[PDB]
Amino acid sequence: KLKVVATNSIIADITKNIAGDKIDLHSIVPIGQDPHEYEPLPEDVKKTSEADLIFYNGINLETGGNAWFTKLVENAKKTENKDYFAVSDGVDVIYLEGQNEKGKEDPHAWLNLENGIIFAKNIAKQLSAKDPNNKEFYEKNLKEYTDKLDKLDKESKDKFNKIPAEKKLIVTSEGAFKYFSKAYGVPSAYIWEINTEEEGTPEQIKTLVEKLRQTKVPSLFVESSVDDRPMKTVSQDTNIPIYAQIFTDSIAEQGKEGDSYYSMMKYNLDKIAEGLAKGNLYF
Template sequence: MFKLKALIVSLSFLVLASLTLIGCSSEEATSPGEEAEGLTIITSFSVLDDIIKNVIGDRGTVSYIIPIGEEPHEYEPVPSDYRKVSEADVFYVNGLDLEEWLEKVVSNVSDTEIVTLSDGVTPIPLVGDDEADPHAWLNPKNVITYVENLVADLVARDPGGEDIYRANAEAYIQELEELDTWIREQVAIIPEQQRVIIVSENAFKYFGEEYGFHTDGIWEINSLEEGTPQQFARLAEVIKDRNVPAVFVETTVDTRYMETVSKEAGVTIAGEVYTDAVGKEGSGAETFIKMIKHNVNVFVDGLK
């Protein structure tokens, strides 16, 4: 489990969460004869929210728990989060242990079914650990698997919406395949020996494996975040040994860690990339596809 501390702290909310659910259920109950249209879906973080919305369209509502800018590995739920899950028809999660602590806490206050969207993705282990890296969504080819799992579950829950779900999924998969083609064209601009992605959290393994990049980071995953002098020195040596022209920072990680590494290694920080959340309104990275395009443009500009 990545964030044991989060699980322990979250358990302290259980009584309060239960009281919140009981106190509010009668307040917002559907009036007699008034039936909500479509499925009510809750998911863990903004990337999944966008993927799901592309498939469900107008036949239901989707919301997510972890705010943009917060770390999925470290987020500590509040009572209103439990309420959202309890009122939903289904709780979609990434899996690969990303939300393991959240799933366990939520299951204590809600019987809403939890469905994993990454089933079928070949996991890449964390360096020096048997646990899987959870960032499978950073490879658009994996997101096609997410969409296929999503459609299968939506159709089972709402057979009447099958035609809508399948048509939306087909259109979105076409966009993902076009994105994959575009990425390969852009990556070809970068000299092969310079295809190295260095960020604070080594989150681009799935992307790197698919598109031919070596990846590294100060730490493997943010729940193990340390930022020690030894970690800085090791990564600075990697950068020097491989003649990496630039490094990058993430929107959800304090930039001071990578600033230290860049100074030690004598390279610039070429830009900011998105990993655990889409961008805020006006960022140009408000959707999954837009955030991936942003990342690729930053990589190309920094490494070519």
């Protein structure tokens, strides 16, 4: 079997849907954990060295202090675009908004299903190149998976139209919803823009608190892969409840709701619409 390493559970799940049992797949970043800053275990180091194919996010996910993925593949002596591939190649990138983050990409492409499709295309392409005997199989799985993703994408374009302007704002800890906001027509706000920066300072919380206390936003959200303390402080200081845990940088654990890329997205879309519609009744 082809030996394949994926950096996080989101890329791993998409690869599973394309490759099934035809490969030997390993995922580095454990479920629920931050993929921005991770220190690979010796078993991850060993799997990476022996891999014929490595998939990572690219666009500024696994690169920061101090570029853990770069260190891993360099030490394992793997070549970019021969041994390891960014699944984000081709995505319409959104950049970070911060004053000093000039030219720096926002990595969270997958929260737009259109990019999920691109991820899958990239994976299928690379698997096929390395494992021609299974090309037809990979391509068929790609066709089915992308149609499933596409139909959910097309259905969800108007999912937030019903939310009045005053209530219409996604609030999470990390500013991980830029692509989601653009794909499904709903603004987002945050405590900190990206995980590599300081995560939940008094000043950040205060900044978001004063923004919120002059909105009618009915619900806050927290991500499965961050410490919830900052958002809980935001909750107390604004009197806006946290409605639900949502998924950004990881899928859910097996057996939980959202334990794949597709159900993660379905769940996010569902739960976010619920929280912003909170209080709505027929009679």
